[PDB]
Design an enzyme around this catalytic site. Sequence first.
Site, PDB file in Angstrom:
ATOM      1  N   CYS A   1      -2.407   6.567  79.845  1.00 11.81           N
ATOM      2  CA  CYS A   1      -2.543   5.602  78.752  1.00 11.81           C
ATOM      3  C   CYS A   1      -3.884   5.654  78.011  1.00 11.81           C
ATOM      4  O   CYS A   1      -4.940   5.472  78.607  1.00 11.81           O
ATOM      5  CB  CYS A   1      -2.320   4.182  79.255  1.00 11.81           C
ATOM      6  SG  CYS A   1      -2.539   2.967  77.949  1.00 11.81           S
TER       7      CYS A   1
ATOM      8  N   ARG B   1      -6.117   1.898  77.226  1.00  9.22           N
ATOM      9  CA  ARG B   1      -6.627   1.082  78.327  1.00  9.22           C
ATOM     10  C   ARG B   1      -7.880   0.231  78.082  1.00  9.22           C
ATOM     11  O   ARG B   1      -8.204  -0.580  78.931  1.00  9.22           O
ATOM     12  CB  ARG B   1      -6.832   1.924  79.588  1.00  9.22           C
ATOM     13  CG  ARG B   1      -5.526   2.378  80.235  1.00  9.22           C
ATOM     14  CD  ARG B   1      -5.809   3.209  81.464  1.00  9.22           C
ATOM     15  NE  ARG B   1      -6.084   4.597  81.132  1.00  9.22           N
ATOM     16  CZ  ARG B   1      -6.654   5.456  81.966  1.00  9.22           C
ATOM     17  NH1 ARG B   1      -7.056   5.044  83.162  1.00  9.22           N
ATOM     18  NH2 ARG B   1      -6.837   6.723  81.600  1.00  9.22           N
TER      19      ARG B   1
ATOM     20  N   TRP C   1       0.936  -2.380  71.412  1.00  9.28           N
ATOM     21  CA  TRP C   1       1.378  -2.024  70.072  1.00  9.28           C
ATOM     22  C   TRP C   1       1.441  -0.497  70.021  1.00  9.28           C
ATOM     23  O   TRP C   1       0.896   0.179  70.882  1.00  9.28           O
ATOM     24  CB  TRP C   1       0.424  -2.556  69.012  1.00  9.28           C
ATOM     25  CG  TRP C   1      -1.002  -2.208  69.313  1.00  9.28           C
ATOM     26  CD1 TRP C   1      -1.610  -1.000  69.138  1.00  9.28           C
ATOM     27  CD2 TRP C   1      -1.989  -3.084  69.871  1.00  9.28           C
ATOM     28  NE1 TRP C   1      -2.930  -1.066  69.547  1.00  9.28           N
ATOM     29  CE2 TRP C   1      -3.185  -2.340  69.995  1.00  9.28           C
ATOM     30  CE3 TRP C   1      -1.979  -4.430  70.269  1.00  9.28           C
ATOM     31  CZ2 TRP C   1      -4.348  -2.886  70.519  1.00  9.28           C
ATOM     32  CZ3 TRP C   1      -3.145  -4.981  70.781  1.00  9.28           C
ATOM     33  CH2 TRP C   1      -4.317  -4.207  70.895  1.00  9.28           C
TER      34      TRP C   1
ATOM     35  N   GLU D   1       3.229   8.204  68.090  1.00  6.08           N
ATOM     36  CA  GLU D   1       4.405   8.011  68.930  1.00  6.08           C
ATOM     37  C   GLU D   1       5.668   7.982  68.086  1.00  6.08           C
ATOM     38  O   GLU D   1       6.722   8.449  68.499  1.00  6.08           O
ATOM     39  CB  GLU D   1       4.295   6.706  69.716  1.00  6.08           C
ATOM     40  CG  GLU D   1       3.216   6.720  70.785  1.00  6.08           C
ATOM     41  CD  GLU D   1       3.206   5.429  71.590  1.00  6.08           C
ATOM     42  OE1 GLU D   1       2.511   4.465  71.184  1.00  6.08           O
ATOM     43  OE2 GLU D   1       3.892   5.386  72.633  1.00  6.08           O
TER      44      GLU D   1
HETATM   45  C1  HEM Z   1      -2.169  -2.122  73.471  1.00  6.38           C
HETATM   46  C2  HEM Z   1      -1.726  -0.971  72.922  1.00  6.38           C
HETATM   47  C3  HEM Z   1      -1.375   0.262  73.676  1.00  6.38           C
HETATM   48  C4  HEM Z   1      -1.393   1.523  73.155  1.00  6.38           C
HETATM   49  C5  HEM Z   1      -1.767   1.889  71.737  1.00  6.38           C
HETATM   50  C6  HEM Z   1      -0.977   2.417  74.177  1.00  6.38           C
HETATM   51  C7  HEM Z   1      -0.867   3.793  73.968  1.00  6.38           C
HETATM   52  C8  HEM Z   1      -0.161   4.585  74.854  1.00  6.38           C
HETATM   53  C9  HEM Z   1       0.447   5.819  74.505  1.00  6.38           C
HETATM   54  C10 HEM Z   1       0.396   6.457  73.140  1.00  6.38           C
HETATM   55  C11 HEM Z   1       1.060   6.308  75.609  1.00  6.38           C
HETATM   56  C12 HEM Z   1       1.822   7.620  75.710  1.00  6.38           C
HETATM   57  C13 HEM Z   1       3.279   7.351  75.317  1.00  6.38           C
HETATM   58  C14 HEM Z   1       4.161   8.579  75.312  1.00  6.38           C
HETATM   59  O1  HEM Z   1       3.709   9.698  74.940  1.00  6.38           O
HETATM   60  O2  HEM Z   1       5.364   8.470  75.669  1.00  6.38           O
HETATM   61  C15 HEM Z   1       0.822   5.381  76.652  1.00  6.38           C
HETATM   62  C16 HEM Z   1       1.281   5.574  77.931  1.00  6.38           C
HETATM   63  C17 HEM Z   1       1.286   4.530  78.825  1.00  6.38           C
HETATM   64  N1  HEM Z   1       0.808   3.276  78.651  1.00  6.38           N
HETATM   65 FE1  HEM Z   1      -0.113   2.578  77.158  1.00  6.38          FE
HETATM   66  N2  HEM Z   1      -0.695   1.754  75.301  1.00  6.38           N
HETATM   67  C18 HEM Z   1      -0.940   0.437  75.091  1.00  6.38           C
HETATM   68  C19 HEM Z   1      -0.759  -0.633  75.972  1.00  6.38           C
HETATM   69  C20 HEM Z   1      -0.258  -0.533  77.269  1.00  6.38           C
HETATM   70  C21 HEM Z   1       0.043  -1.613  78.125  1.00  6.38           C
HETATM   71  C22 HEM Z   1      -0.091  -3.073  77.754  1.00  6.38           C
HETATM   72  C23 HEM Z   1       0.464  -1.086  79.341  1.00  6.38           C
HETATM   73  C24 HEM Z   1       0.906  -1.846  80.543  1.00  6.38           C
HETATM   74  C25 HEM Z   1       0.406  -3.052  80.918  1.00  6.38           C
HETATM   75  C26 HEM Z   1       0.432   0.346  79.188  1.00  6.38           C
HETATM   76  C27 HEM Z   1       0.767   1.275  80.152  1.00  6.38           C
HETATM   77  C28 HEM Z   1       1.038   2.614  79.810  1.00  6.38           C
HETATM   78  C29 HEM Z   1       1.724   3.496  80.764  1.00  6.38           C
HETATM   79  C30 HEM Z   1       2.174   3.139  82.160  1.00  6.38           C
HETATM   80  C31 HEM Z   1       1.875   4.690  80.160  1.00  6.38           C
HETATM   81  C32 HEM Z   1       2.524   5.927  80.749  1.00  6.38           C
HETATM   82  C33 HEM Z   1       4.049   5.821  80.820  1.00  6.38           C
HETATM   83  C34 HEM Z   1       4.665   7.088  81.401  1.00  6.38           C
HETATM   84  O3  HEM Z   1       4.104   7.776  82.291  1.00  6.38           O
HETATM   85  O4  HEM Z   1       5.785   7.452  80.998  1.00  6.38           O
HETATM   86  N3  HEM Z   1      -0.037   0.627  77.933  1.00  6.38           N
HETATM   87  N4  HEM Z   1       0.081   4.309  76.177  1.00  6.38           N
HETATM   88  N1  LIG Z   2       2.263   2.037  72.585  1.00  7.30           N
HETATM   89  C1  LIG Z   2       2.672   2.153  73.879  1.00  7.30           C
HETATM   90  C2  LIG Z   2       2.304   1.185  74.814  1.00  7.30           C
HETATM   91  C3  LIG Z   2       2.725   1.311  76.132  1.00  7.30           C
HETATM   92  C4  LIG Z   2       3.520   2.384  76.496  1.00  7.30           C
HETATM   93  C5  LIG Z   2       3.951   2.526  77.804  1.00  7.30           C
HETATM   94  C6  LIG Z   2       4.749   3.609  78.156  1.00  7.30           C
HETATM   95  C7  LIG Z   2       5.116   4.554  77.207  1.00  7.30           C
HETATM   96  C8  LIG Z   2       5.982   5.731  77.605  1.00  7.30           C
HETATM   97  C9  LIG Z   2       7.247   5.783  76.751  1.00  7.30           C
HETATM   98  N2  LIG Z   2       7.979   7.051  76.943  1.00  7.30           N
HETATM   99  C10 LIG Z   2       7.975   7.415  78.367  1.00  7.30           C
HETATM  100  C11 LIG Z   2       9.029   8.474  78.657  1.00  7.30           C
HETATM  101  C12 LIG Z   2       9.214   8.582  80.165  1.00  7.30           C
HETATM  102  C13 LIG Z   2      10.005   9.821  80.497  1.00  7.30           C
HETATM  103  C14 LIG Z   2       9.413  10.852  81.226  1.00  7.30           C
HETATM  104  C15 LIG Z   2      10.142  11.995  81.535  1.00  7.30           C
HETATM  105  C16 LIG Z   2      11.464  12.100  81.115  1.00  7.30           C
HETATM  106  C17 LIG Z   2      12.053  11.068  80.387  1.00  7.30           C
HETATM  107  F1  LIG Z   2      13.330  11.170  79.978  1.00  7.30           F
HETATM  108  C18 LIG Z   2      11.324   9.926  80.077  1.00  7.30           C
HETATM  109  C19 LIG Z   2       4.679   4.401  75.897  1.00  7.30           C
HETATM  110  C20 LIG Z   2       3.878   3.327  75.536  1.00  7.30           C
HETATM  111  N3  LIG Z   2       3.447   3.193  74.258  1.00  7.30           N
HETATM  112 CL   LIG Z   3       8.687   4.807  71.845  1.00  5.27          CL
END
Ligand code: HEM
Ligand SMILES: Nc1ccc2ccc(CCNCCCc3cccc(F)c3)cc2n1
Ligand SMILES: [Cl-]
Lengths: 362, 362
Positions: free
Chosen positions: A65, A68, A237, A242
């Site tokens: 993420c 963070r 947000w 994305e």
């Molecule tokens: C506040 C604005 C936030 C932005 C702009 C942001 C941005 C991102 C982005 C761009 C990704 C990659 C998404 C992808 O390529 O599929 C990501 C991954 C992630 N974010 Fe954030 N995020 C935010 C908030 C949060 C919040 C609030 C949480 C949880 C409390 C969180 C937890 C995660 C997690 C767990 C992933 C990885 C998910 C995975 O492995 O599939 N994020 N974030």
């Molecule tokens: N802007 C944000 C905020 C929080 C987020 C938290 C999590 C994510 C991940 C969304 N896409 C995850 C895809 C997970 C996955 C991985 C491998 C295979 C598959 F089909 C799906 C995007 C976020 N974007």
């Molecule tokens: Cl999405």
Amino acid sequence: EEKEILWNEAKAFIAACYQELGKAAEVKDRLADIKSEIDLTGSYVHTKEELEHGAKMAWRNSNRCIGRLFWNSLNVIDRRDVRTKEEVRDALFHHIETATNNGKIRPTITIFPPEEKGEKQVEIWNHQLIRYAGYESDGERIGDPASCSLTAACEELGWRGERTDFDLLPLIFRMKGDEQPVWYELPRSLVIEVPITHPDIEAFSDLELKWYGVPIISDMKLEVGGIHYNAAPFNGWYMGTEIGARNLADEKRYDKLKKVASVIGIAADYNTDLWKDQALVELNKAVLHSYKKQGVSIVDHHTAASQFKRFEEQAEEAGRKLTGDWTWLIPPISPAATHIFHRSYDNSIVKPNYFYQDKPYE
Amino acid sequence: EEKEILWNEAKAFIAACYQELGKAAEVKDRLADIKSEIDLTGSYVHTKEELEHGAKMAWRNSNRCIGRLFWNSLNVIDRRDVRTKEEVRDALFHHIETATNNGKIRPTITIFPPEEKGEKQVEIWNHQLIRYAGYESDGERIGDPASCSLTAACEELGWRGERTDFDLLPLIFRMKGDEQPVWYELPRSLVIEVPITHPDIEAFSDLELKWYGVPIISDMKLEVGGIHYNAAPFNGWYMGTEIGARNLADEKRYDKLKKVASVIGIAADYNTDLWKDQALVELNKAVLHSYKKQGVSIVDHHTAASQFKRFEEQAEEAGRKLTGDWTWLIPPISPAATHIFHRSYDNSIVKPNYFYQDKPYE
Ligand code: HEM
Ligand SMILES: Nc1ccc2ccc(CCNCCCc3cccc(F)c3)cc2n1
Ligand SMILES: [Cl-]
Ligand code: HEM
Ligand SMILES: Nc1ccc2ccc(CCNCCCc3cccc(F)c3)cc2n1
Ligand SMILES: C[C@H](O)[C@H](O)[C@H]1CNc2nc(N)[nH]c(=O)c2N1
Ligand SMILES: C[C@H](O)[C@H](O)[C@H]1CNc2nc(N)[nH]c(=O)c2N1
Ligand SMILES: [Cl-]
């Protein structure tokens, strides 16, 4: 082995948590209370403070993420009290409303009862609370391909999509004890969508693209001190890439670059013209422009990376080890223009954290 | 331990090499010959065939290289016979000429005598045979910052740069036995340079950008069957992103994006305008356009990735394990538009290969 794994995670979590919260002297008593509760019930119950902080630490520890910096301002809603499918529905409905906050998105997590002995109390089937259906029949492709299997699963359950490219999926989840999940149509008044237009290119509207305002990931497990909260949807947000670089751009998603190139008036014939690159940039500019114009929160990848750099600085000056996944932290457009590209990150897993879990369908 | 390490690498290399060359039955005799030679001299000498093939395998094994489809067509020049600094100079001069090939670049490696007992026979100081000097004095920054320490080292040796932004560094290398390296100015007739212009935007010429035609990496060690060829310059042709997205774009290199934005007529004020992204795309289009127009070989990152996909397919159908470095294989612009971004690669090190080695200055 189960109780032992639990006790060990609990000791590490409470220590760390109470130390960060300046409550170090309360650890010994709390851990004893916990130790008995585990011996006597097989598990333990988090205080409001532990749960709120553990959800924040979990965000702080998400290696992938980029957003963070704002981990400590996460809005945590405690719904460990729900018992009925109506209650779950209303809690999910509420989460959408308060997170959306009329466009000024509040990062929010709603936490439902955790697993008991691997037994889920509530089992959410949606990947996100708001997402578009996908259909693939006889070469005919409609909507979001990433949603195809869930859509087919819902259409087993009595639901039917209008088969537009932007059908909202209903909420679908199962309760402990029930054999099948239930489904509820989303109230349209709760869902903000944004039409995609371009600041300079009027023709861009001809594409009739749109996307939803708030990404609310609802299929990951929150783990805190040995307790498994399989049902705990959360949101931030969007970062524009994305939407503009993946959701609308990927060949296995909406696949819009050829159409984008056409409306912006460039040929899509030769690789050396870099028409995919130009199309990506204009689509991504349009997405940022449309969200701002609609008054819905969004961040560009540059600002986001500068924020993450601050997160890095904050981590060091607080004496905390930083962890990250370089392959996911870099943005899918102009990655070498951000500092992230030019450094390395340790990808170790620190708990609390959010984890993938097996899907209940497929 | 030295002889043992050598013998073991030699056994593995000859086996693999002779098997690929359909010469499997000649292994036993060759290995015996090798075993004696090592016992008697402390080392062994590669046949023409072994050396040529080992250099090709080394390219095939470079995890970070996207251009590996063409590994088998590498032009190998054997210069293990050189003994004088004049001979080295002329061999390096020749390499430039034949690799450049009037713009139709031939991927070429010139191989010099290898180390004996860690003792280098020839020690090249240049990072590339053709590269621009860099100067940093009293806040004044001229040319290529990546070249600053080598430039300062050359200016210790009696050379002086004109301090333009595009000063060609002289060749600099040291011979076994000599205390100091020598340096030789490059004949300008041998060096093709390309002025950077844009297909649509006439003003782009106002930037007065240019770059050299052939990247000839000259500071890496080729390792083949236990033999360490520390001096073995090689070249391909450029992928445009190397120039447009990094060399001219990086803040710690030529840092031209603000100037690019100005000549293409966009503001460089707001992150949400994605002006860095737009500037990158136009600069990269200009680089590809200028090279093609000049009749100098270059590849765009899309074509390059499709070629690498073919390399992958070729590797499987030949039963060879594929290795790669995902973090270096993805291109620094629109990486998610290539298949590389969406798969994973094993980053194990297979020999023969090219390796980093310590710089003789700094
Ligand atoms: C506040 C604005 C936030 C932005 C702009 C942001 C941005 C991102 C982005 C761009 C990704 C990659 C998404 C992808 O390529 O599929 C990501 C991954 C992630 N974010 Fe954030 N995020 C935010 C908030 C949060 C919040 C609030 C949480 C949880 C409390 C969180 C937890 C995660 C997690 C767990 C992933 C990885 C998910 C995975 O492995 O599939 N994020 N974030
Ligand atoms: N802007 C944000 C905020 C929080 C987020 C938290 C999590 C994510 C991940 C969304 N896409 C995850 C895809 C997970 C996955 C991985 C491998 C295979 C598959 F089909 C799906 C995007 C976020 N974007
Ligand atoms: Cl999405
Ligand atoms: C024929 C055209 C070629 C193209 C388009 C090409 C493309 C590339 C690119 C873009 C890189 C990454 C450069 C960077 O980011 O700094 C790279 C790395 C590399 N290439 Fe190639 N390459 C080609 C030929 C060759 C040849 C002929 C060899 C050697 C025989 C070679 C060996 C390597 C090695 C060793 C690296 C990694 C260097 C390092 O780790 O610093 N390539 N290639
Ligand atoms: N087009 C090509 C062909 C072959 C190549 C072979 C090698 C390279 C790498 C050039 N840049 C390597 C930089 C090595 C390095 C690594 C860490 C720190 C540092 F200062 C330098 C580029 C190539 N480009
Ligand atoms: C830390 C990280 O590996 C480093 O910045 C790498 C990233 N990937 C790269 N990829 C290429 N092609 N060239 C580079 O110089 C780098 N730098
Ligand atoms: C194999 C590779 O890790 C995979 O394609 C990743 C690359 N990095 C990513 N980064 C983000 N933000 N999102 C993704 O879906 C992916 N996919
Ligand atoms: Cl280069």
